Amino acid sequence: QAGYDLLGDGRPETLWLGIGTLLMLIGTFYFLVRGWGVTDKDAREYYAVTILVPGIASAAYLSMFFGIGLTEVTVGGEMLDIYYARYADWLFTTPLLLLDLALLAKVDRVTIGTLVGVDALMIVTGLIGALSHTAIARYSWWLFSTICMIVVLYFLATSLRSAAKERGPEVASTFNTLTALVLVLWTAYPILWIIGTEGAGVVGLGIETLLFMVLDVTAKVGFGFILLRSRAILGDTEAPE
Numbered sequence: 001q002a003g004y005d006l007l008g009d010g011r012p013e014t015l016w017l018g019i020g021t022l023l024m025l026i027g028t029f030y031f032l033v034r035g036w037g038v039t040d041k042d043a044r045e046y047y048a049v050t051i052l053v054p055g056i057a058s059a060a061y062l063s064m065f066f067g068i069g070l071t072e073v074t075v076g077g078e079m080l081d082i083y084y085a086r087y088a089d090w091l092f093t094t095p096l097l098l099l100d101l102a103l104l105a106k107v108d109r110v111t112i113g114t115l116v117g118v119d120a121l122m123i124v125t126g127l128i129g130a131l132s133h134t135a136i137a138r139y140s141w142w143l144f145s146t147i148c149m150i151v152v153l154y155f156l157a158t159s160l161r162s163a164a165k166e167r168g169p170e171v172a173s174t175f176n177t178l179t180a181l182v183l184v185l186w187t188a189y190p191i192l193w194i195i196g197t198e199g200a201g202v203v204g205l206g207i208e209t210l211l212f213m214v215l216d217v218t219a220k221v222g223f224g225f226i227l228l229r230s231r232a233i234l235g236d237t238e239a240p241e
């Protein structure tokens with residue numbers, strides 16, 4: 001695989017895991033220090049949700065760096081490395097990111113429950129496909145989890161977009177910027193997953209880990225950078241509970 005064996009344990013992908021760990025930690029501390037001088041009740045809610053997104057990713061990338069949670073999967077006569085921490089990362093951070101967008105749109109708790117429910121179903125069925133032993137099952141779960149992603153993305157571009165436009169041009173501008181970013185970044189995940197080691201095997205584990213790291217830092221540090229610098233987080237919020 002493309003990369004360099006930093007720890008001397010036969011894993012060239014630790015170079016991209018180490019870089020991702022640094023970028024997540026730097027982004028976590030940057031949002032944390034920037035949020036200490038924040039007294040607005042609503043802005044503190046966004047900082048609380050957003051800081052956790054690279055903070056949890058930092059722990060997952062640190063665990064994947066040291067090899068904690070690494071195991072093998074046999075699909076015929078080939079051996080596939082799977083990092084459990086990667087999916088546990090997405091299981092926690094994707095609901096928080098959707099919560100950030102739901103706070104901007106100010107949608108009801110039933111809307112949020114359907115959103116995070118389908119989002120979690122997308123992640124679990126993605127892990128199930130990564131653990132299956134036949135290629136037919138791996139593509140079948142990938143297709144099911146992709147459909148669930150489309151359902152989540154459709155709700156952001158239709159229901160949550162219309163509700164956000166009623167809250168004024170400032171929130172609508174920030175919500176449109178983030179949603180435009182989410183529609184393209186999140187779509188890149190099943191594309192890489194199906195062309196990487198878990199799918200056709202076109203992309204090795206090295207480049208896939210590097211590309212997954214770039215998507216992760218952009219969907220977390222880049223997403224939070226656009227949100228936390230906008231004036232929309234000062235507007236009134238209503239947490240689902």
Ligand SMILES: *C/C=C(C)/C=C/C=C(C)/C=C/C1=C(C)CCCC1(C)C
Nearest residue numbers: 126142145146149186189190193219
């Ligand atoms: C901060 C981390 C984020 C926003 C991760 C997002 C991950 C996805 C949208 C993954 C989607 C997948 C499919 C739709 C097909 C099955 C395989 C997955 C889990 C890679």
Ligand SMILES: CCCCCCCCCCCCCCCC
Nearest residue numbers: 108110111114118121147148151
């Ligand atoms: C009160 C506003 C929210 C009402 C939501 C009702 C629509 C529920 C859609 C359920 C979609 C399930 C997808 C299952 C996997 C494709």
Ligand SMILES: CCCCCCCCCCCCCCCC
Nearest residue numbers: 150153154157183184187188191
């Ligand atoms: C208005 C339609 C809303 C739902 C659209 C969901 C699918 C988004 C497709 C984005 C395709 C990105 C292609 C670039 C990936 C490298």
Ligand SMILES: CCCCCCCCCCCCCCCC
Nearest residue numbers: 003004015019023213214217218
């Ligand atoms: C023999 C050691 C080779 C080291 C090669 C390093 C290449 C540069 C890596 C830069 C990190 C990727 C940028 C990702 C930014 C999201």
Ligand SMILES: CCCCCCCCC
Nearest residue numbers: 028032051052055056059
């Ligand atoms: C308020 C900082 C959030 C960082 C999350 C750390 C998670 C520890 C496992």
Ligand SMILES: CCCCCCCCC
Nearest residue numbers: 058059060062063066068
């Ligand atoms: C919650 C972060 C766990 C990091 C584990 C590092 C283990 C180093 C031996």
Ligand SMILES: [Ca+2]
Nearest residue numbers: 040042234235
């Ligand atoms: Ca306020």
Ligand SMILES: [Cl-]
Nearest residue numbers: 038039040043
């Ligand atoms: Cl403030």
Ligand SMILES: [Cl-]
Nearest residue numbers: 039040041042
């Ligand atoms: Cl206040």
Ligand SMILES: [Cl-]
Nearest residue numbers: 002204206207
């Ligand atoms: Cl590779």
Ligand code: NA
Nearest residue numbers: 005006007014
């Ligand atoms: Na290594």
